[PDB]
Amino acid sequence: HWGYGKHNGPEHWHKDFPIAKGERQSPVDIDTHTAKYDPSLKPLSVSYDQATSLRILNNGHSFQVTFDDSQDKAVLKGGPLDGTYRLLQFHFHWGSLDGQGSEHTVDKKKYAAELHLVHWNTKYGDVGKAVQQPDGLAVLGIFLKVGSAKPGLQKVVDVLDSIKTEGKSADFTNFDPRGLLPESLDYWTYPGSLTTPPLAECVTWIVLKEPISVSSEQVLKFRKLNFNGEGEPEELMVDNWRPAQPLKNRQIKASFK
């Protein structure tokens, strides 16, 4: 089906998923001079000390680490959110060159990659119900810039050889997602959508201001993954990002002056 290619990429998605042309699509460009400081926003509360990672898998568009979401073990709350959201998975978007790869942009600046931690609202009981609701999901977005290595990322980097091709997975227990956070939790927030099909408009986006640094050797290993399955022609998994969409009738809010 869909992908990031010339013949099946984001400009084609509306044919199968007409909400692609909807009123609250993501990602967007964050224009820092038009964002509104909102003093009523609360600090984010990230409680990941009890997180239980399970598996790591190549799904043909990205790779994801999945977590046990059967209890409140790793939760996100506060900020613009009402209620408790459980961590389900995280994944990345990255580019073929260091000057591209993020989905959100800041004053039109692209970062080398973007990390998405996907959480769902526990009032809805299961994630399938949550994606049907306007406040069903909260995705925490973190920008990656190339510089010094991020020690907390290396354990992800070292297992990617074992999930090179579409459909491969591997046990990936005891991974602590706190190692992927920047120092500051200052953020922008806006109502948006999933950035992959089905592009459901169910996401409160929380995009952190401070990027994390990763080394050139770390991001190079992202670029060695494959879109294709084993035994097919090799296409490198790169540029798996959706370009910015129209903001339309939305306000981006900032948690900081």
Ligand SMILES: Cc1cc(NC(=O)Nc2cc(S(N)(=O)=O)cc([N+](=O)[O-])c2O)ccc1F
């Ligand atoms: C109908 C339905 C869809 C989903 N899909 C989903 O949650 N996440 C997902 C999100 C993004 S993103 N960029 O929107 O956060 C990127 C990737 N990916 O690229 O692998 C993902 O696999 C989950 C439950 C559900 F019932």
Ligand SMILES: [Zn+2]
């Ligand atoms: Zn994503």
